[PDB]
């Protein structure tokens, strides 16, 4: 979560007690989703490589 900056570098928890906090926190979660999708594509390439190597 810290690597995904969902929590502060010191461990502070991302709060939503403020309305403006929710609007700004949206971009954080969008970036987290984008990184998750990038990792998913990476694992996709991984298993495609693995199965190609297996059949070869």
């Amino acid at each position: 979560a810290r690597s995904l900056n969902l929590k502060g570098q010191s461990g502070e928890l991302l709060s939503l007690s403020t309305a403006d906090k929710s609007n700004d926190a949206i971009g954080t979660l969008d970036a987290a989703l984008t990184r998750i999708s990038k990792q998913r594509a990476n694992l996709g390439a991984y298993f495609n490589r693995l199965e190609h190597a297996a059949k070869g």
Binding site: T34, S37, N48, R49
Partner: protein, 112 residues
């Protein structure tokens, strides 16, 4: 001599079978990327999805490059094209006949 000759011929045909086996998967390793590229033509896609497709294609091409670098049969590489039409290193000969001069060549280009 003839008895050794058919053994040499069948060994060479086994080598060619190894070559074709190194080829079918490469055909797949080209076609799935062909399909992905055709899919990329759609305009509804964003830019981040294009970046992820490029990331995929990175390892996908790495696969065929690794295969070409390591495609080997009896401690000899094949897809590097050392034996192309303009061969730069050496050649292989198939002694299919009992006579010393009854040797034949086969040519495979660089597949990198």
């Amino acid at each position: 001599g003839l008895r050794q000759a058919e053994r040499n011929t069948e060994d060479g045909m086994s080598l060619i079978q190894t070559t074709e086996g190194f080829l079918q998967e490469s055909n797949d390793i080209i076609q799935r990327i062909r399909t992905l590229a055709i899919q990329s033509s759609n305009g509804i896609y964003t830019e981040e999805d294009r970046q992820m497709i490029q990331v995929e294609v990175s390892q996908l091409i790495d696969e065929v490059d690794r295969i070409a670098s390591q495609a080997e049969f009896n401690k000899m590489n094949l897809l590097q094209g050392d034996f192309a039409r303009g061969s730069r290193a050496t050649s292989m000969w198939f002694h299919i006949g009992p006579n010393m001069h009854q040797r034949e060549r086969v040519f495979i280009a660089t597949m990198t």
